[PDB]
Design a binder for this molecule. Sequence first.
Ligand SMILES: *CCC(=O)N[C@H]1CCOC[C@H]1Nc1ncc2cc(-c3c(Cl)c(OC)cc(OC)c3Cl)ccc2n1
Length: 268
Amino acid sequence: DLPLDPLWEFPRDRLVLGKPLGEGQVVRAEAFGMDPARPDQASTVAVKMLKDNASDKDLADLVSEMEVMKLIGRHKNIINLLGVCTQEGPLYVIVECAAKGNLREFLRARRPPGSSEGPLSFPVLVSCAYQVARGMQYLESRKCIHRDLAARNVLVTEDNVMKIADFGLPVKWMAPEALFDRVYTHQSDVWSFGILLWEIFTLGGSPYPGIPVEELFSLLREGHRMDRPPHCPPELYGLMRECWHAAPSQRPTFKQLVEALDKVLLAV
Ligand SMILES: *CCC(=O)N[C@H]1CCOC[C@H]1Nc1ncc2cc(-c3c(Cl)c(OC)cc(OC)c3Cl)ccc2n1
């Protein structure tokens, strides 16, 4: 028995559920009048709900995620909360559905064969990174630490807009202070962003490729980092490397990443 939030409650009978998207449940669905300024207009959305096997605590976690998404509020470059169903029936949390899946798969699927030019230009790739940096700057301004930023946790819209996912609630993405000291800050997220930038300019590459998940720590400690990937401009590699300074205070801020990437896009 949960409160009725008049800012968020959406009628349970305007929500037509569809095929599962992922188990543990999340279900795609048609929503009628998610935009109250076109209230017969239908839209595809994603709906999180509990599986019948779920404890007192599993309900608490879905409640807190719904509550944190309300508090963080709306931005173009995150998965936005759209509505909830809390009354006389199971708890539904309704959010944006992105047609083209996660950014890792978007890029892999758009690999050209061998040495040929692929549909993803330098500016589109820099734009991807720009949009992720703007999303993270927003989440940081609302006191949200992601803790797991990676191309698999960014989703892509029908219009190729980047949307950070799973910010409500992977050693090769983690800052040294997060690996050894279990310390997560905004600057930890900046390390991860560096890794995500590498992923973008390798079109969805597996970071530290070859290198076993047990040799990494020693390579980082000795001051080793991934090499510049083929065809990546030095300006972009230098941003990755700045992200991978050992000292968190020497990494750029998301604000500075937004400015640097902005400068590159203006220069096209
Ligand atoms: C929209 C059509 C469709 O079915 N798209 C699929 C394409 C391939 O990838 C899976 C589907 N897309 C998609 N889009 C958005 C999703 C959002 C969530 C999600 C997130 Cl990211 C979230 O972040 C805080 C919170 C919640 O619920 C509280 C949810 Cl449901 C999950 C899956 C998504 N899949």
